[PDB]
Design a protein around this nucleic acid. Structure first.
Ligand code: ERY
Lengths: 7, 118, 122, 55
RNA sequence: AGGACCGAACCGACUAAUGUUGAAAAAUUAGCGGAUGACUUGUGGCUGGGGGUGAAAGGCCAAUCAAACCGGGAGAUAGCU
RNA sequence: GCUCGCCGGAAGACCAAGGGUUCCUGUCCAACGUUAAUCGGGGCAGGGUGAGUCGACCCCUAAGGCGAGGCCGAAAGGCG
RNA sequence: ACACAGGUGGUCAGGUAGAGAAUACCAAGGCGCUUGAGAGAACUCGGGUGAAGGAACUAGGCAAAAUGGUGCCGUAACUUCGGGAGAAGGCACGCUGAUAUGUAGGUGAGGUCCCUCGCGGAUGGAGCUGAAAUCAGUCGAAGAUACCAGCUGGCUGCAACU
RNA sequence: AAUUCCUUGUCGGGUAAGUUCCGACCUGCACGAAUGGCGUAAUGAUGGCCAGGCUGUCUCCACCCGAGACUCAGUGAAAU
RNA sequence: GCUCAACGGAUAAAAGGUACUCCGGGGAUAACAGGCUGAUACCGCCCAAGAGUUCAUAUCGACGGCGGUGUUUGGCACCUCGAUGUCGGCUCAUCACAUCCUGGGGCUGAAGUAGGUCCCAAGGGUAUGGCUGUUCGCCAUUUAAAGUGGUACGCGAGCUGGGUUUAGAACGUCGUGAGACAGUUCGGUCCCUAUCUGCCGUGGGCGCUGGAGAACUGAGGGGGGCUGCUCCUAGUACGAGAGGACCGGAGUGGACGCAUCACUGGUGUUCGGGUUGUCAUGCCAAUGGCACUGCCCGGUAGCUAAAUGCGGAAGAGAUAAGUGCUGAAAGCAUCUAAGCACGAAACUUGCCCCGAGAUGAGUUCUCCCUGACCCUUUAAGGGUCCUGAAGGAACGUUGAAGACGACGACGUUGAUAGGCCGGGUGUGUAAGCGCAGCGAUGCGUUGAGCUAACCGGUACUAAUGAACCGUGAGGCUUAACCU
C-alpha cells in the first residue's frame, strides 16, 4: 500500500 | 478535581445509586441492623438519617415525602409509628457504624450499620 | 468580542446594512475588538441609494456588543446585536450623518466625540 | 514495546524489593473477653470495646 | 399500473469512530442504500483445474487462486545465502 | 424470600437442520468454569424417550443420478 | 480452536399511544450477560452543556449541530409534458366546555308486517362504537412537547435511468 | 476540456483577496464523429464549486456524566 | 561452403510485457537520509576602470583575483536491501548568527523627519487569511517585525494522510499488441500493553557518627527579560516653507505568563420547577420508575475564562563596538605601551521558585535518655536480665492535600467527619382543606414547601485504654582551657 515503502 | 465536593460515585451512575440507597434504607429500617461495605455505610448514613428526621413530625405531607423517598408503605408505617416516638429525644446520630473484618470473596471492607436503640 | 468574520450591523446611515470584520486593528495577534476599537470591514449588503457600495474595504468602530462592556462600578451593559459606525479609511471620521440607537459613554474621546454627539442615547 | 535484551535476576530482585507485605503491628486485646482483634473492628465473637454488639 | 415513492423485517456495505498481541483471521456503534423485483431465501441437484463460473474485478471455486488441494515423480534443480 | 433493573415482532414460546445424553435425581469439588464455589452444560452412580392418527418408512413423481440390452470409445470408460 | 459482542430456515405474536411487525412503556414468560471492592489524577473511549463569534478549522463543513409529523395555502427555471415537487416557503396543532346530557358515519336488538317458512326479507331504531370541525375558555417559556421523524438552494463534469 | 506541456494562458463573473469553479477566446504540444461527436429532462451513498441555515470544526477550550487507566484481593498472558 | 562481426564461434532455427506478479540473493548496486568532496550555490574579502555635476572608495562597483561555510544543484558509492517509513499540514520544540524588530555606535552626497551603509549585540519577540496537496509563490489586510539556516530537508512506537508511489477505471499520446507515460483524472486498511537511556512528577531505604523535633544560611540550578500608541517638554531646537525632534516624563494598550473566583459568565446527570408517553403504588388525589439527565427551564458550592489583580523593572558591577583624558616610544603627533574615565535589551547581580545526598552531607535553638552483671578471638567485642525516654509509626475521622505513597488537621483533656439546629442561597405560592366555576383551572391559607457541596454553632454518632518501633550519656588523635 506504498506509504511505508521506500518506493 | 473534587475540591469540596460531597457524595461518593461508588462506581455507579445516578439512577443506580439512588435506587440502591432506597433499597438499603428500606432494609435498614426493616431489620434495624444490616451488614454492608464501609463507604456504602457512610453514604447510607447520609441517606437514611434525613428520613428519621422526617419522621419526627407526623402529618400527611411528611408521610407523602417519606413515601416519595422510600416507596414502601410498610417502611413509612414503621418510620412514623416506631422510629418517630423512639428517636424523639436525640438530635441527630440515629445510626452507628461498626467495622467487621473483610469480605471473603473480594476482600472488601465490611461494616455493620445499625440504629441506636438496640 | 468582535473577531474576524463577524457580521455586524451598521449604526449610522452610511448606506451599508451589514458589514463583516476582516481585521481587528492595533497590535500583532490581536483577537477581539471591544467598543473603543477600530476594525477593518468589508461591506456585504448596502442600500441601493447609499454613500458606500458593496465590496468596499474601510474602517469602522464598534458601538454595541452582545458581550457587553463592563463599568468600573461592577456593572455591565449588554446590548442585543453587534453594531458599528463606519469611518473614513484614512481620515478616521464617520461617513453618515445620523446615528441610530444607543452608544456607550466608554466611547468618549475626540473623533468618537464627533460620533457621540449624534446618538440618541449614551 | 519489547526489551532489547532480558533483565537479570538481580534487577528483578531489586524491583521486587518494594513488594514486601507489611505485617499488622499488634492486635489489641478486648477488655472483657480478652480476644485479639484489629483496632476499631469488632471481635469474631461480636464484642467492641467491652460491649456485645452483634448477636 | 409501475425493474414507481417513503419506510420496518430481509438483503447489502457509503461515511466516521472504535477495535488492530480484537469480543471478532473482516466485527461493533451511529448515521447509510435497495426493499414487488434484473428481489431475497430454504432444501436438493449440475458444471471442476489450463478446467468451471463470471451484469468482467484476472474476481470466485472450502480463511488457499495470473492456474485449488492431496499424493506421487522427488532427496527436481539451486554458478545463490 | 423481599425490593431494584433489563428484554418483551425478544434476551419469550414451539420445531426443522445440526448436535448426541448436554434432560432429571442423588452425590463430589482434584482438573474444567478466565475469580471463589456449597453451584454447573464439570466427575460419578442411577433414572428418563410409550403413537393405527405427529414424522420417517410407504405410494407417486421434478431437477438430477444410475441404467439391462444398445450406440460410441487404446483400456479404464462415456452417453443413453 | 473458546461457556467466542459474529452467523443460522419456519411457526406464534397480548395492552396503552401509534399508520405500523417502527418506536416508548408494560403482560405472559425469561434474564441481570461467572472477577469483585474502593478511589474519583493525566490520558483514552462514549456522551451532555456552553458566553461572544459562526467554517475563521481542514485536502474537503469530515464529524457533529440543525431539519423532521399531519392537514391546509402556495410553489420557479427547465422538461422527454410523466415530471421537477415533499421545490422553495408559510400557518394550525395541548386540555376543558358547547354545538352534540357525544354529532356525521359504522354496527344494528327488541318489536311490528310479508312468506313459498328460515341460517328468510322489509320498516324500525334501542344498545354499542365513534371521527373530524367551529366557537368559547384555560394553563405553560415551549402543545407534531418524550421516543420517532427530509437540511435546503444555485452552477457544472461523467454515466440516460433501476 | 476526465484531453493544454508551456501555464496559475488571457479576458469576464463570483471573493477583501480565487493555481480550484463558471462564461468566453482558439496558440487543439497531443478533440472529433458507433474503440461514436455534441446536447439533454429525470436519476446518482458520483466529482468539483458557491450560498442560506446550523453548530466546540475553529478562535480556545471549560465543566459535567459514565467505561477503563490508579489502589486492594483472586486468576493470570504475549511479542521480544 | 559461416557480417558464425556479440569476430575462442552455446542451437540448423528465437521478440516483448508484468503496477497481478513470484523466488533466491545483494548495501558487491541505485532511490531517502548520513559520510567524503565542494565544481555549482551562498556569504566575505583584494585590486580598481567607471558611475555618483567635479570627485573611484556616501552608495554601487566592471575586467580579473583570494577565501569561508556546508548551504542549493551536483560528484563518489563508504553505512543500511535477514527493512534506516516519504512531501506537506498539526502539536512540541531546540540551537547558530551570516540580526527582521528592539538596543548600542561610525560614516553619509546626515538640516529635521525618515533613510542608506558598516561595526557590536542572540535577552526577549518574530502575523491572520484567499488560492494551491503544496514547501514556495502571488494576493488582501495588519504589525515594532512578519529574520535566515541547522536539528534523518527536527518531529508517523506523537496525530493526519491531501501529494507522490500497489491492485480498479478513464482521457491525450506512444505501441500491431500485452501495456507504458516526473502527463492528467476519480477511488483506495497508517500496527505496537515501554525493558533500558532520556525527560516530567512523586515516594521507600540508608547515609550525614547518641537519638529526635523544628527554623534557616545558602553552593548550585531554573523561570523571567517583548513592545506599540497617546500626552508633556514643544509645535521648541532644525528648516525659506512643507514639515518637525534628540534627551526626558507620565498615562494607556496588544501579545505572554503567574495567581484567584470578589465581580461578569460557563458548567453544575448530587437542588427546585414545568411538561410528553407509559407502567406501578387498590382507586381519586399525590408521587415514583423508565424513555440520552425523556425533553426542557433556572441554579448552590466547587472547578473555570471570555472575568479580575499582578509581573517584565529601577539600580549595581565588569564590559563589546565606539568615544575620550594624560602620554611617550618617534622634540611633533597619537584613546595605549605605563596610567585614568565613559560606554549596550548580551555577561554577573538585583526579582521569583527549587535547593545541605552541597557525601565538602553546613549552622542555630529546643528536647530526651545517669542500670546491674557474666563470657570470650579483653574488641569501636558478644550475651543475659531490668528499663524503654524524647519521638515516631501503625490505627481511626478526614482535608479547597492527593493516581498510590506523601503532605496537613484531629482522636473525647475532642468540632476531625456525618447528623442536628439556626441562617444563607436556589427554585418559585407545596400538600391538604375551603371558596368561585359545568369544567379545565383560578383564588385564600402562602413568597409557601423543598433545598447538594456553603456559613455560624451543637458531642447526638464515629474517632478505645493500650500494645509496636526507637534506648540506657554516645570512638581515637592532637590542640586550647578548666577545676
Ligand atoms: C493490523 C496490524 C498489521 O499491521 C499493519 O496493518 C500495519 C499498519 C502495516 O502497514 C500496512 C499499511 C501501510 C500504509 O503502512 C502503514 C503500508 O505501507 C504497509 C505496506 O502495510 C505494517 C506496519 C506493515 O509493515 C511495513 O511494511 C513496509 C513494506 C515496510 C515498512 N518499513 C519500511 C517501515 C513496514 O512497517 C506490514 C508488512 O503489514 C507488517 C507485517 C509484519 C504484517 O503483515 C503484520 C502481520 C501486519 O499486517 C499487522 C501487524 O497485523
Amino acid at each position: 500500500m506504498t506509504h511505508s515503502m521506500r518506493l | 478535581m473534587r475540591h469540596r465536593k460531597s457524595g461518593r460515585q461508588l462506581n455507579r451512575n445516578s439512577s443506580h445509586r439512588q435506587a440502591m440507597f432506597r433499597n438499603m434504607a428500606g432494609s435498614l429500617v426493616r431489620h434495624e441492623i444490616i451488614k454492608t461495605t464501609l463507604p456504602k455505610a457512610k453514604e447510607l448514613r447520609r441517606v437514611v438519617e434525613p428520613l428519621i428526621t422526617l419522621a419526627k413530625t407526623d402529618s400527611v405531607a411528611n408521610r407523602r415525602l417519606a413515601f416519595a423517598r422510600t416507596r414502601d408503605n410498610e417502611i413509612v408505617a414503621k418510620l412514623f409509628n416506631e422510629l418517630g416516638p423512639r428517636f424523639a429525644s436525640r438530635a441527630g446520630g440515629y445510626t452507628r457504624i461498626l467495622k467487621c473484618g473483610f469480605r471473603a470473596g473480594d476482600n472488601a471492607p465490611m461494616a455493620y450499620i445499625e440504629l441506636v436503640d438496640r | 468580542m468582535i473577531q474576524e468574520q463577524t457580521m455586524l450591523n451598521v449604526a449610522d446611515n452610511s448606506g451599508a446594512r451589514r458589514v463583516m470584520c476582516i481585521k481587528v486593528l492595533g497590535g500583532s495577534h490581536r483577537r477581539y475588538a471591544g467598543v473603543g476599537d477600530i476594525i477593518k470591514i468589508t461591506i456585504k449588503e448596502a442600500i441601493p441609494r447609499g454613500k458606500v457600495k458593496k465590496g468596499d474595504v474601510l474602517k469602522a468602530v464598534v458601538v454595541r456588543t452582545k458581550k457587553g462592556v463592563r463599568r468600573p462600578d461592577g456593572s455591565v451593559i449588554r446590548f442585543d446585536g453587534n453594531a458599528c459606525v463606519l469611518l473614513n479609511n484614512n481620515s478616521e471620521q464617520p461617513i453618515g450623518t445620523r446615528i441610530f440607537g444607543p452608544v456607550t459613554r466608554e466611547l468618549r474621546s475626540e473623533k468618537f466625540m464627533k460620533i457621540i454627539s449624534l446618538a440618541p442615547e449614551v | 514495546a519489547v526489551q532489547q535484551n532480558k533483565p537479570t535476576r538481580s534487577k528483578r530482585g531489586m524491583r521486587r524489593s518494594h513488594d514486601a507485605l507489611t505485617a499488622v503491628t499488634s492486635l489489641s486485646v478486648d477488655k472483657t473477653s480478652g480476644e485479639k482483634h484489629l483496632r476499631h473492628h469488632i471481635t469474631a465473637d461480636g464484642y467492641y470495646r467491652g460491649r456485645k454488639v452483634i448477636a
